[PDB]
Amino acid sequence: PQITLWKRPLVTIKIGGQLKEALLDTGADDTVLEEMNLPGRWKPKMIGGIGGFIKVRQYDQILIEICGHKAIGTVLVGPTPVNVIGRNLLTQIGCTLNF
Amino acid sequence: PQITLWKRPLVTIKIGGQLKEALLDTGADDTVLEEMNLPGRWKPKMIGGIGGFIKVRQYDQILIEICGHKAIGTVLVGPTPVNVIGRNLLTQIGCTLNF
């Protein structure tokens, strides 16, 4: 579909057997999601933006479904104020910017 | 244009008569540029990102050309990690997400 940007581009995602809401975020290199206790191993990581850095857990090869489109990639989990779908997954669903 | 997301969606902008590079950021409500000199009045504002809040200078009704497309709107100037074009101006240039 086509999503205009008058409001935040929020969509429903499915991850770890749960449904969440997340922003389609072209300014996010990586995908960063609210605290959730996903199974399996992870690696510590720090990601930075406006205001500084936060500590997150990096999970690899995670299946996510975004508006019915399936993707598989790295997800960062931690105390983020907003769930964002980053370019690592947006490319996999064929998302482009158009003007 | 149609812009894929395998790389960062960086474009050239013109503001205050100066060329800069900025990131088309659908996750940003507002447009935030690194420290620079802009003519005219400004008001202090606070904005919040992934790591907390920062202080910025709010410039209203500023002319800015983004990848050949003109906008006139609010530009925030302060210690952002990178120049970002947010939805307040992405809407002005007719930018949508598509997949």
Ligand SMILES: CCOP(=O)(COc1ccc(C[C@H](NC(=O)O[C@H]2CO[C@H]3OCC[C@H]32)[C@H](O)CN(CC(CC)CC)S(=O)(=O)c2ccc3ncsc3c2)cc1)OCC
């Ligand atoms: C409950 C609400 O909490 P909140 O208000 C903050 O909420 C939000 C927090 C973050 C966002 C998304 C964030 N937008 C943002 O900063 O936008 C500012 C300006 O416009 C305003 O609108 C929204 C906030 C204000 C960017 O799209 C993406 N970011 C990187 C960019 C930084 C500008 C480029 C470097 S990233 O997230 O830092 C990030 C993501 C993946 C990644 N992989 C490796 S690094 C790395 C860094 C949206 C809402 O309170 C504060 C605690």
